[PDB]
Structure formats: C-alpha cells, structure tokens
Amino acid sequence: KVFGRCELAAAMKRHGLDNYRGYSLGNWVCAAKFESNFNTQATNRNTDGSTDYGILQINSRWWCNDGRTPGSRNLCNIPCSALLSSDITASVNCAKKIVSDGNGMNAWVAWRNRCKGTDVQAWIRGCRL
C-alpha cells in the first residue's frame, strides 16, 4: 500500500510514535518518506548483503528473518515479509525496539542524512491529528 502523508501520520500517531523516545511525529514521517516513499512494499538491498523491508526499511541483518542473510539476527522475531503488509503494526512495533537500542533514530542512516537537524514538523503540516 502507498500511504498518503497525513494518513501515515495519523496511523503512526495512533500507534504511539509521536514523541516516542522523544522523537516527534514529523521525524517518523520524514524517515518514512526517504526510506520508502510511504510504500509498504519497498525492499532494497544493502551493500552488506542484507535487505531493508517496508515503510521504515527495517534490515534483515539484525531485526527480521528473510532466510538469506548470513550470520544475521531476528531481534523483532518476525519474518521480514510481514513488514510489507498494508498494516504497519509489525513495522511500528519493531521500530520502537530499534529506536530504543541506544543510538535513537540514528539507526536509520536516511533519517540522520536527510531529516536530522531539519524542520521535520513540515512533514505533518496540514494534517488533522
């Protein structure tokens, strides 16, 4: 599914991401925009052989099992394919564990490179929240 911007912000807010570990909702929408373009079915290969899955591009090295990523872990205890659902629940829940892992949203390189230090409130401008 390709989410609308405000649709996704509403769903993320409903799932408790606004100010989760101190990250305002626009940070999460910004990350989603540059990871997936709001598309739940997005998959992209990493240089290390792992793959990133779903609206927040969660990686198979640490977080989900895709059956093809050597010496990897599955800390969210989920098949990576379940991150591509039109229901963002599994993505959101797994992201809550990643952001709690110590480096905050720096775990998402695209957040660090494209959202951090910018006016992320812009991503929820106009949304009825």
Binding site listing for substrate:
101
Cβ-proximal residues to 101 (8 Å cutoff; 6+ apart), any chain: 107
Q: Name the amino acid, one letter, at 63.
A: W
Asked whether position 85 contacts Cl ion by CB under 5 A, the answer is no
Residue 81 binding: pick among Na ion, Cl ion, none (C-beta 5-8 Å cut-off by kind): none
Check if 7 is active-site: no
Residue 5 binding: pick among Cl ion, Na ion, none (C-beta 5-8 Å cut-off by kind): Cl ion
Q: Name the amino acid, one letter, at 69.
A: T
**One-character DSSP codes across 89-103:** HHHHHHHHHHHTSSS
CA geometry: angle 74, 91, 97, nearest 5 deg: 60
Gap between the Cα atoms of 106 and 112, Å rounded? 5
The structure tokens listed for 67 are 């059956």
Candidates 121, 122, 125, 129: give the one binding Cl ion (CB under 5 A): 121
Candidates 40, 51, 59, 72: give the one binding Na ion (CB under 5 A): 72
Of the pair 2, 11, the CB lying nearest Cl ion is at 11
Q: Which residues pair with residue 39 across a beta bridge?
A: 2
Asked whether position 102 contacts Cl ion by CB under 5 A, the answer is no
Candidates 1, 2, 5, 112: give the one binding Cl ion (CB under 5 A): 5
Active site residues: 35, 52
The footprint of Cl ion (CB under 5 A) covers 4-7, 11, 14, 24, 26, 67, 69, 72-74, 87-88, 104, 121
